[PDB]
Structure formats: structure tokens, C-alpha cells
């Protein structure tokens, strides 16, 4: 198997449209119920639609009914969310989930963000390791973006052990900031190259940084 | 709409321990009909879409382990973890589907308590390439410590700074059961160009007495 895959969410301007979808395989999708549900970043999970299998009775959440419309089309396993008038309330990773006993098989989740404020992306700049061990910490600190998110790997999903990428902070600017980190064997430093793969989809800006011992 | 209340916010629970986290309803959730209480356990590990454990109050999900156990009748609902594991670190939600709308509790994050961990403490300068668009960022970074609480202050030609940094911290390891935090000084090049001495200061409770990293500007 079961996969659901949402997409369609990004920047918006409030009072704003997008529609999602929730694309379904290794199912049968008209033998089951189908769900929306949000969650504010750092906040909590917030049911906000479902529909029957036939999409013949659906419900929402007070807060979004008579802006939001569920649908389905049985025919291309495809489950949608049309989001009208959107509000600085509505930003939210919003998820899919498949009625079974519970709601089940969760997709990886959309970000919408409601705002009127500018893309921009991040620079990127080396947190170099220095001369002090058995470990070494190395970084990159990926500066002043807007909308959320970036993602960060190391050596193209290569490095994962030992990876610390923070949860992003809102400066005094309102422009986002966040450092990914690394510990590895100091030993590795003379011979093994890190480089930083960082992308803000939002803005179109992708870095490769590569983080040399000064 | 039916409110679903979890009990505690927050809960600490050491390796190979008994967590119980409870859930109420402000109406039953029977269905008379079913036989079935329509009452879903989720765990939400960090950085992870939420993953089902129960429904009907207290049928497991196939693959879930027996260590999770949902009880109650009606009202009163509750999750029992048996013999805590590093990986199950998360927010767990209760969640009513018994009438739409289909609400959630406002979830109980679970904190695994484990030995107290020193931070691992490292201090990177500003980039040149940084200081050249006329802004310097100083970063601290405490790795890998247990419990949360530290204390980091910067001194820079050790005059305390205040107002000019910003701390994050990860959630707890779903392995190592630790955090880590970035501490960021940002000064512009012109006040970074007029001092030395560079200091990230940390207070917590593994190291015998505070640990200061530091760099000298230009070296
Ligand atoms: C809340 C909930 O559990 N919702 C689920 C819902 O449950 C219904 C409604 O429950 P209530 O809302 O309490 O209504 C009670 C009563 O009707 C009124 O009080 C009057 C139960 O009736 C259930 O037993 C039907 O299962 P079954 O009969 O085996 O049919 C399966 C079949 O559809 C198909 O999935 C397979 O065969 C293919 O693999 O079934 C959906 C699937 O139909 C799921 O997607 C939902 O998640």
C-alpha cells in the first residue's frame, strides 16, 4: 503494498486555491474510506475530511467546511482536496490516510503554506572542521529562506550516520535559517570529501557545498 | 464535536519500563451495533507520517508489537507500553471514529529517559565567503547529550552577549535516545571585525563544570 503519495501543496497567497491529490496503489481504492488530515508544524495531528467509498457522504472539520471540497475518482485512484479562501490557519502539513479498522498506510504529508510573503533561498555557507579527539564535526548553515522547507543530505544520501539537520528557526528578518551537521572519524578528514546536497524546491535553489577542513 | 482528552502532555519513561498514557472522551464512543469502542492509538516518531497501532480501543494492527496494548470501555481509554524501546520515542494521539468529525487528542510526547550524556562541544567561525555579503554567523553545537537542559552563553572579548543568538535543539535519537542543539551568534562584519575572542560557554548536568570552546578571529 500500500502507498499513498500526496502532492499539489506549496506557497499560496491567502484567500488563495490549490487542490491536492492523494494518489493510491497496491489497493483496491473504492473498497475503502479515504481521509485529510493537517498538522501545524510542531503542533498536533487535526482531522479534516474523509469520504466513503463512492464519495457519496463526506464530512469536515468546522474549520474548513464550505472552503474545503473532497473528491475522489475511483477510476484513476486518485483522492483530491480542492482548498478555497485559504487562511494563515490553513498552513500545515496536510496528509492522506486510508480507512481500514483505523486510519492507515499515511502518505509522507504536503506543506501548504498560506502566506503573501516572497520565495527566497537560502545561501549556504561551510561549517568547517578545525584543529583541536577520535571525532570530527563538520556543518552547513543554510541562511535567510521563505517559504519552508530545504532538505539536506551529505554525499548525495551516501552520509546518514551521525547527521544532525535542525529544525529551522524564523530570524527577526521573518527569513528562516537552520544548520545540517555531521560527526565522522577525524581520521576520515585528510582523504574522505563531504559536500552538503541542500534544496529549497520553493525558490528553485540547489547547492552543492563542499566543507573542507581549514 | 466529540473532545478527546490525553493524559499527561508529557510523559518520561526509562528503557525497559511502563508507559501509560491515557485518553477521554467527552461522550462514549461505543458502538452499540459493532460491539466495538471506535478508539485509534497512533505513535508518531519524529520527522515520520503517524503510523496506526490500534483501533477498537484494543485490536493491534498486524506487525505492531505486543508491548503496545490499548484498555477502556466508553470514556476512559488507555495505551500501555511494556519494556520501553530507544524507537519508540514519539508523540502518541488517541483519535475517535465514531462520528465526524473523525477528532484527535492533543497528544502525549514521550520522552525515554536513559544516562546522563556530556554534549560533545564544537564552535565553527564564520565563513569567508559569509563575511564577504557583510554578515557573520558563529555557530556552538552540543552534540549528542541527555537530559535536555543546557545552558550555553556566548562571550565575545568575554563580554556576555544577549539578544543576538538563537538556539534549536533535534528531538530525542530513535537510537541513542539523545539531543543536540545549534547555538547561532550573528553579528554584522563590522562589530565581528572589532573583537577577538570568540566563546561558546556550556552548562550541563554530565560535565564536572562548564565547557568553553573558543577560536581567535583570523586564525
Ligand atoms: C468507522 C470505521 O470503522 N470505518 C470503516 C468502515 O467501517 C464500516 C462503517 O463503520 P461505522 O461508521 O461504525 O458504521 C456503523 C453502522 O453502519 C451505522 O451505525 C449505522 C463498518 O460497517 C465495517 O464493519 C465495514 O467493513 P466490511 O463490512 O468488512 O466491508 C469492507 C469492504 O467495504 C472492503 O473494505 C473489503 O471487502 C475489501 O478489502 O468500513 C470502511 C470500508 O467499508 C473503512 O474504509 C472504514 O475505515
Redo the contacts with the bound molecule.
Keep these: 503494498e500500500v502507498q499513498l503519495v500526496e502532492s499539489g501543496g506549496g506557497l499560496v497567497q491567502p484567500g488563495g486555491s490549490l487542490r491536492l491529490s492523494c494518489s493510491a496503489s497496491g ?2 481504492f473504492n ?4 481521509h485529510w488530515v493537517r498538522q501545524v508544524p510542531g503542533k498536533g495531528l487535526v482531522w479534516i475530511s474523509f469520504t ?2 463512492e464519495g457519496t457522504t463526506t464530512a469536515y472539520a468546522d474549520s474548513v467546511r464550505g472552503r474545503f471540497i473532497i473528491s475522489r475518482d475511483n477510476a484513476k485512484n486518485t483522492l483530491y482536496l480542492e482548498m478555497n479562501n485559504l487562511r494563515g490557519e490553513d498552513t500545515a502539513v496536510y496528509y492522506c490516510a ?6 492507515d498506510d499515511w502518505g509522507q504529508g504536503t506543506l501548504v503554506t498560506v502566506s503573501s510573503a516572497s520565495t527566497k533561498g537560502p545561501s549556504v555557507f561551510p561549517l568547517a572542521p578545525s584543529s583541536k579527539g577520535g571525532t570530527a564535526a563538520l556543518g552547513c548553515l543554510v541562511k535567510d529562506y521563505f517559504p519552508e522547507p530545504v532538505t539536506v543530505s551529505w554525499n548525495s544520501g551516501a552520509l546518514t550516520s551521525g547527521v544532525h539537520t535542525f529544525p529551522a528557526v524564523l530570524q527577526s528578518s521573518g527569513l528562516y535559517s537552520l544548520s545540517s551537521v555531521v560527526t565522522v572519524p577525524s581520521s576520515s578528514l585528510g582523504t574522505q570529501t563531504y559536500i552538503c546536497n541542500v534544496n529549497h524546491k520553493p525558490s528553485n535553489t540547489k547547492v552543492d557545498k563542499k566543507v573542507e577542513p581549514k | 464535536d466529540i473532545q478527546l482528552t490525553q493524559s499527561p502532555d508529557s510523559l518520561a519513561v526509562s528503557l525497559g519500563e511502563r508507559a501509560t498514557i491515557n485518553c477521554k472522551s467527552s461522550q462514549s464512543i461505543f ?1 452499540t ?2 460491539n ?1 469502542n ?1 478508539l485509534n492509538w497512533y505513535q508518531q516518531r519524529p520527522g515520520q507520517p503517524p503510523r496506526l497501532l490500534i ?2 480501543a484494543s485490536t493491534r494492527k498486524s506487525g505492531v508489537p505486543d508491548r503496545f496494548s490499548g484498555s477502556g470501555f466508553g470514556t476512559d481509554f488507555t495505551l500501555t507500553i511494556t519494556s520501553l524501546q530507544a524507537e519508540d520515542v514519539a508523540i502518541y494521539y488517541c483519535q475517535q ?2 462520528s465526524p468529525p ?1 477528532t484527535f487528542g492533543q497528544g502525549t510526547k514521550l520522552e525515554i529517559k536513559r544516562t546522563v550524556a556530556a554534549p560533545s562541544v564544537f564552535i565553527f567561525p564564520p565563513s569567508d565567503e559569509q563575511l564577504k555579503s557583510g554578515t557573520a554567523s558563529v555557530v556552538c553545537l552540543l552534540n549528542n547529550f541527555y537530559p535536555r537542559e543546557a545552558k550555553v552563553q556566548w562571550k565575545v572579548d568575554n563580554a556576555l552577549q544577549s539578544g543576538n543568538s538563537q538556539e534549536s535543539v533535534t528531538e530525542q535519537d530513535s537510537k541513542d535516545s539523545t539531543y543536540s542543539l545549534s547555538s547561532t551568534l550573528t553579528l554584522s562584519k563590522a562589530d565581528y571585525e572589532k573583537h577577538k575572542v570568540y566563546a561558546c560557554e556550556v552548562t550541563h548536568q554530565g560535565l564536572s563544570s562548564p565547557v568553553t570552546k573558543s577560536f581567535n578571529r583570523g586564525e
Design positions: 489497493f483496491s473498497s475503502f474510506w479515504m466513503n467509498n486510508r480507512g481500514d479498522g483505523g486510519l | 458502538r451495533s459493532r466495538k471506535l483501533h477498537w471514529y465514531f473523525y
